[PDB]
Write an enzyme that holds these catalytic residues in place. Sequence first.
Site, short mmCIF file in Angstrom:
data_model
loop_
_atom_site.label_atom_id
_atom_site.label_comp_id
_atom_site.label_asym_id
_atom_site.label_seq_id
_atom_site.Cartn_x
_atom_site.Cartn_y
_atom_site.Cartn_z
CG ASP A 534 -5.79 -47.39 0.76
OD1 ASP A 534 -5.16 -46.33 1.02
OD2 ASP A 534 -5.93 -48.33 1.58
CD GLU A 537 -0.13 -42.64 -0.40
OE1 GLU A 537 -1.20 -42.26 0.13
OE2 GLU A 537 0.08 -43.84 -0.57
CG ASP A 599 -3.94 -46.04 7.57
OD1 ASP A 599 -5.11 -46.12 7.19
OD2 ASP A 599 -3.02 -46.70 6.99
#
Length: 1060
Positions: A534, A537, A599
Amino acid sequence: MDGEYHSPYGDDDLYTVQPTERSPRDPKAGEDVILNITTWPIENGQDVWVEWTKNGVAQENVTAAYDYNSGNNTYWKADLGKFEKGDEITYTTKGSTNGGTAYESGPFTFYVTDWEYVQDVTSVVDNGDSITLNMTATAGDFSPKLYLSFEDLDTLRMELSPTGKETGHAGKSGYTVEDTAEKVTVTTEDLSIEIQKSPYRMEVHQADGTLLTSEYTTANSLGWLTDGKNVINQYQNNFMTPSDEAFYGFGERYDTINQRGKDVETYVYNEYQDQAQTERTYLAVPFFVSANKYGMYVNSDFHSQFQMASKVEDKYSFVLDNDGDMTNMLDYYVISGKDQNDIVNNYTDITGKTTLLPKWAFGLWMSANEWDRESDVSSALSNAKANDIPATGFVLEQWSDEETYYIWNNATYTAKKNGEAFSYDDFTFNGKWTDPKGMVDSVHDAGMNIVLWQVPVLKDDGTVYEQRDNDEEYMISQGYSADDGTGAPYRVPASQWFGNGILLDFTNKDAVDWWTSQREYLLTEVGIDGFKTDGGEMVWGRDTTFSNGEKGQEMRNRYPTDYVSSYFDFAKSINPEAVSFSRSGTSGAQKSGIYWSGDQTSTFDSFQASLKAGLSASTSGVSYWAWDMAGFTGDYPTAELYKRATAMAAFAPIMQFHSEKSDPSPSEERSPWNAVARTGDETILPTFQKYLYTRMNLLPYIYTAAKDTADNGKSMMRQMAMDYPEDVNARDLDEQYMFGDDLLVAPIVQEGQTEKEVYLPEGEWVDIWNGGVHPGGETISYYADVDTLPVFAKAGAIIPMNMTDGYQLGQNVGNDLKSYDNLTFRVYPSGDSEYSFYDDVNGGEMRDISVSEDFANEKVSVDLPAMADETTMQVFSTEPTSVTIDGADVAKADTLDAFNEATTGYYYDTVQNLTYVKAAAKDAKQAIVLNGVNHAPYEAEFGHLTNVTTASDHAGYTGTGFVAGFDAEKEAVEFDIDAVDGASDYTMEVRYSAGVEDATRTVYINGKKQQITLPKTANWDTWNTVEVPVTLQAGNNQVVFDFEADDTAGINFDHVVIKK
Ligand SMILES: OC[C@H]1O[C@@H]2OC[C@H]3O[C@H](O[C@@H]4[C@@H](O)[C@@H](OC[C@H]5O[C@H](O[C@H]([C@H]2O)[C@@H]1O)[C@H](O)[C@@H](O)[C@@H]5O)O[C@H](CO)[C@H]4O)[C@H](O)[C@@H](O)[C@@H]3O
Ligand SMILES: OC[C@H]1O[C@H](OC[C@H]2O[C@H](O)[C@H](O)[C@@H](O)[C@@H]2O)[C@H](O)[C@@H](O)[C@@H]1O
Ligand SMILES: [Ca+2]
Ligand SMILES: [Cl-]
Ligand SMILES: [Cl-]
Ligand SMILES: [Mg+2]
Ligand SMILES: [Mg+2]
Ligand SMILES: [Mg+2]
Ligand SMILES: [Mg+2]
Ligand SMILES: [Mg+2]
């Protein structure tokens, strides 16, 4: 005064600014330069000023004026004025209170730039494997060079050196050049590149002369932004686009699949939930495919902006950033190919092929953040089993200590120094995870594989935690982090996710070996099957510097892919079946596993966005794509959303459920059993089962498409214009798609909807659930209740399946990945069709199957190659009179039980209109022939009905029943019939029952009327067939049966068949 602060670029964020930046960050000629400066605390008698030089000459100090106060600080603006191209400005900001301690920031330097553009081609030099175009510029004193080369004969590469000091790369030599005074034409067998010399202007054509794209009409399209001496900060090119051009891809996009009208930013970003509204994404790629049959890839990791007819209506442009390095050439490609998918294949030749994943990746993945201990895992596995949910994937997110992220929660141990790696034996496992290896063992025992959640950052929230502090200490001392630009480790900006945390520099091999060695025991000893990597960024700041020498502007988009790829290769080196599951990346992301859409919320708006994300990601070469089914957070989904989402997810590249909440009450699991619990709708379970079982029935077709992605660049799920780029009705479709080569899937993504529009391209399409036939070339209306998904098979489709002895879609075959139950090939005969099946169960041998439809002579032939398993063909046709294998008749089985017990034979399924043919396994081709067969029936009960209904009370009918009575005026049944072999006369068989008396009906064929006689049958349990001469034309033939004033008697109408 306790301080002063100014930093011209802040965190270099694309969307926001810090309150102490320079505006503009990078000044151009004629732009007013403002410096935002802060002092603290707020106090009277403060002076703020700027000391500076212009072109080495000291200027009079500029005094800053107050702007506003906030918190403990005063904010000021110093106005430096405007400058000219070439001006070099160096400044230091200063603050002092009452002549005392001056505090300062700087020195900072900027070079004032302006745009220079290509003017004319002065000479052309053909070097055999490259072509140099020497140019003039509209301004400045450079002597630019544009180099052309061919990555392949259908793929053009352009490399621009503004100064002319750099040289382009060699490519293919198979081109010819026709150079004249006003123009140069470069030709291969696939492209014709026409270039006007004065002014310079390129047009890219296919070999046949058809225009693909071209630089803007006014020329001077190609440029660079420079001060003429020190820096080149940006590049641009501008192109002409007609009003109807559609633009697809650009990575994963949530707002629209067609970016015409948008300014598209190639910039990875973590945007929680409102990706569509902000037009942001975790996965950004500077590659687009146009429905005008070309793709364009700008080869650079720096941020770029694609302006797709967003400023001027007939112009698209790209603006690419650079770090100032004047030796960095602009490098982009115009990509052609045999079709749109071949354009994507050509793109993956440049940036990387998708890596084939093991078959377990393509089963259901179960996940929930709330699973945080062994009892949660044993319960998930027990619930899955109790509800007959044979998943193949399992994810743990809340598994660790939440400090180091490589240690199981509650584990105790002797903290280590020097980043030395732990082994399973070093830990005493307690509480939530008393036996991690055993837990993992139980997952494998259930036929599933497990992945663990990871981040690329070493957490540092200021709290003390021995082992974490030890690792931070070691990481910094080895230079394993990235540098902030001053010798200190780079930390994520404070207000962001994992703010203050230190990124592992994934460009540094030694750093990567260390970071992964801490996780090694998880794979070697615990036995996990991959990582859910995950984040990523997280790279901000221009001065952020990496071991490869690159800085923050260049590395922001690349970093997440360096991270994901590093873990993917690592896991795989220890466990060949390992799989990564990630969200962020750029060009090349496709080489390293699965990408999920991130998400979102449990709403229909979010569902629509998720589909746009998967479709755009597909065009961009990211084929192995997933989403959190029905959303991972928000109010729990309604039974309707969960059902509509389950349908789509089952017919998507990667099927996966997930939820956000860490410890909710009641459970937030998006599992089917929890959905029943939360909504109170028990019907959710059999609907979910139906879809999951159908996906497992289709796993052979799905996995073969997964291999086609890896080898030939064809994504698994594709927007309609990828297969039909010339079809004007396919351009903007975002609520249906192609799955594999032959299935058209049309999910219902609108709340309350039950009448689903489906656009059918040219050809014949067959409902895979019931055999309903739909000629193409129009938008049909499919009635889909909440449990139903329109799915259609293309003409000529050959689809491998894994069936039970029931032989119907939706029957639970289990999750055995190492053998088949009943290996079956579903076939929709149409001309000559071929298919190459990936038989992974038997060493991965390609089984080349071909089918030859010959309905004009009442025959369908199948050339089955050697197989390792017993095979069952399911061929859409009427009932044969005989079936031969190698010229020998095989036995007709009256029932399905008899068909199953036979070693070879055939059986006709009357409901589905499918002829089953069973062949034994042999090390030799087998020639199967079905004699006396015609195109499958067009069932009356599937026709467009007017004032008449269906029934099924008299046995012997085909399909699900028949139209009953049909004996009053204005009652009609209309079919959509295709000519089997082009425009011609044909015989139409009409199957009916008329148990009381002779009847007549009126038939219209494309408006042409005839009356037909249907004599009396012995009783209503007796069917008869009448042959009627018809003249059909190409495409869709409207065949309307009416009961008119002069017609008579009731009948039961079973079907019509079209034959010679
Ligand atoms: O009670 C038995 C009888 O009930 C239904 O109809 C009574 C109907 O009989 C006579 O007309 C029929 C007409 O409705 C239509 O029938 C087609 C129908 O026949 C059978 O079903 C009828 C019912 O309609 C049933 O026997 C058969 O099982 C079913 O599948 C068929 O669709 O057409 C026939 C032939 O013209 C006609 O005889 C009678 O005239 C009428 O008064 C009465 O309402
Ligand atoms: O693709 C054919 C058809 O499929 C569905 O309908 C199937 C349905 O049709 C009649 O109502 C029969 O009487 C039933 O036995 C069948 O299940 C779609 O709803 C329809 O739109 C579509 O054309
Ligand atoms: Ca029927
Ligand atoms: Cl008959
Ligand atoms: Cl006719
Ligand atoms: Mg819309
Ligand atoms: Mg190619
Ligand atoms: Mg829990
Ligand atoms: Mg293993
Ligand atoms: Mg033929």
